Write an enzyme that holds these catalytic residues in place. Structure first.
Site, PDB file in Angstrom:
ATOM      1  N   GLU A  63       0.638  -1.000  -0.059  1.00 15.49           N
ATOM      2  CA  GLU A  63       0.181  -0.105  -0.044  1.00 15.49           C
ATOM      3  C   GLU A  63       0.997   1.523   0.034  1.00 15.49           C
ATOM      4  OE1 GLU A  63      -2.505   2.019   3.407  1.00 15.49           O
ATOM      5  OE2 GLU A  63      -3.847   0.842   2.183  1.00 15.49           O
ATOM      6  N   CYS A 171      -8.343   8.010   7.150  1.00 22.60           N
ATOM      7  CA  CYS A 171      -8.064   8.202   8.715  1.00 22.60           C
ATOM      8  C   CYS A 171      -7.107   8.661   8.384  1.00 22.60           C
ATOM      9  CB  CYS A 171      -8.400   6.567   8.491  1.00 22.60           C
ATOM     10  SG  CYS A 171      -9.033   5.716   9.315  1.00 22.60           S
ATOM     11  N   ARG A 191      -7.489  10.874  12.522  1.00 24.84           N
ATOM     12  CA  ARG A 191      -8.749  11.094  13.484  1.00 24.84           C
ATOM     13  C   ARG A 191      -8.834   9.298  13.725  1.00 24.84           C
ATOM     14  NH1 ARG A 191     -12.893   9.338  11.092  1.00 24.84           N
ATOM     15  NH2 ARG A 191     -12.530   8.017   8.419  1.00 24.84           N
TER      16      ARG A 191
END
Lengths: 282, 281
Positions: A63, A171, A191
């Site tokens: 990723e 996120c 967050r």
């Protein structure tokens, strides 16, 4: 004698168990929860891949590399045999969002696009954005090379205008870099953090990015500072975490970069070896 | 129950015992530590620091000027508050190449990002109504309909607008969150001058949490101040060393006098700070 950097993550878990509040709802989900925490992970000669439980290192590196190229195409990653985004690229799922005209795997302007072209009008996953929007990653690498003292060295993925176009809202809202005595530090503002599944991956992602950026600017790695907004655990994970918190941490592994790389785009899964990694069984 | 201000003072002792030397843009030095966090209770107290007076009126009047969407420095100094004037002066606009701007046009700064994020900025007297995203109104709507949302965020770093701006914002983002009818708020500041600014800043966002708690009908819970670069300027080491010797006094209390229903409708007279009794300096 300085304590193992993994005890901070385990403390945060003790804490949520002692004080989170039960944002309810034994009706699927159901969580314990606390708002605002902060943890500091050294990057000096160790690399904080958690050990009391194994982290999907391969999904981490792949990723991250899919974000650096700016992709927003989930099939493009899923072919590195990392599937974590495919549910989000699945046609029934886009279809539940009025993305009815999007090709399966089009996630919208998610991290790679915000890191590479923040601001560009987003068309779709195959378009070419060369030259459009701001390229935060590059601007960040240049500011480090040429003004390490700058207190403005930030990278933002939260783009309120793009948000209704994303197949899920990010996120990680923002990360800030910072440079002193030739060490490079990094602070991630997250967050929302699932203390069981994601937080250990998310810690690996951002540490790794710090290594790669330290490498390419010839600084040495410092601290990675993980700050959390909503930190939670799902009720169903309490049992397994309760067992997991008995396991004594084992020394963090190390990470070598196996060649001298000069552009960030230049990196490849093979330039990295994680050496020494020995976690508890699951 | 320790007193809220000890966290702030804590952070001082720490920067003095471990901060490292580090220079700013002009060259002035500082001791700096990267990454810090503090929690201030907002329940029946209001954390205006008491070991050194904070300019309460700049705090109130500024936050009102943010909410109004404004990015004119003049519409602020007219209320008797001048902290933004220098960044608006004719000399300064010129050094940045903004030869074209009316003096006191600050570019797209918090005003514009909280109410119009991503609108194209034109000048300060433009009208942007219905443009860009109104992040302030959106946070309040979400606090009311989905209080367990975990994305209740406002963001003022916008890389696109950064060169249009007098200076890059220092408060990057704030998040809110709700649990048991309590509203908490977290603030990520990229850089923090522990002496002059942090206290002022801790009062802006606390005050902003009381406003949003008043309108959405909850009570204020915590305010979490997270810092990127925490630094003490050199010249200030000495004053702060005195300052560390003061016993803090009980924080005062913020009273809100009428019932306001909309955030655009607060005025400076709606607000009363009571029992504020900070040390002399």
């Amino acid at each position: 004698r300085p304590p193992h950097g993994e005890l901070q993550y385990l403390g945060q878990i003790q804490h949520i168990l002692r004080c989170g509040v039960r944002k309810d709802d034994r009706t699927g989900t159901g969580t314990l929860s606390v708002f605002g925490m902060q943890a500091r992970y050294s990057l000096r000669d160790e690399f904080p891949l958690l050990t009391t439980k194994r982290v999907f290192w391969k999904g981490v590196l792949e990723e991250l590399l899919w974000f650096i190229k700016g992709s927003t195409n989930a099939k493009e990653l899923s072919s590195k045999g990392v599937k974590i985004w495919d549910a989000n690229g699945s046609r029934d799922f886009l279809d539940s969002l009025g993305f009815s005209t999007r090709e399966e795997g089009d996630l919208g302007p998610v991290y790679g696009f915000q890191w590479r072209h923040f601001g560009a009008e987003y068309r779709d996953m195959e378009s070419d954005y060369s030259g459009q929007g701001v390229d935060q990653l590059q601007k960040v690498i240049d500011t480090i090379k040429t003004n390490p003292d700058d207190r403005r060295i930030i990278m933002c993925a939260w783009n309120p205008r793009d948000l209704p176009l994303m197949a899920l809202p990010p996120c990680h809202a923002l990360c800030q870099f910072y440079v002193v005595n030739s060490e490079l530090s990094c602070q991630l503002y997250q967050r929302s953090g699932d203390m069981g599944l994601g937080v250990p991956f998310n810690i690996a992602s951002y540490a790794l990015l710090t290594y790669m950026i330290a490498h390419i600017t010839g600084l040495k790695p410092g601290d990675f500072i993980h700050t959390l907004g909503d930190a939670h655990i799902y009720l169903n994970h309490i049992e397994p975490l309760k067992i997991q918190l008995q396991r004594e941490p084992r020394p963090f592994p190390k990470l070598r970069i196996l060649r001298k790389v000069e552009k960030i785009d230049d990196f490849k899964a093979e330039d990295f070896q994680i050496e020494g990694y020995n976690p508890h069984p699951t």
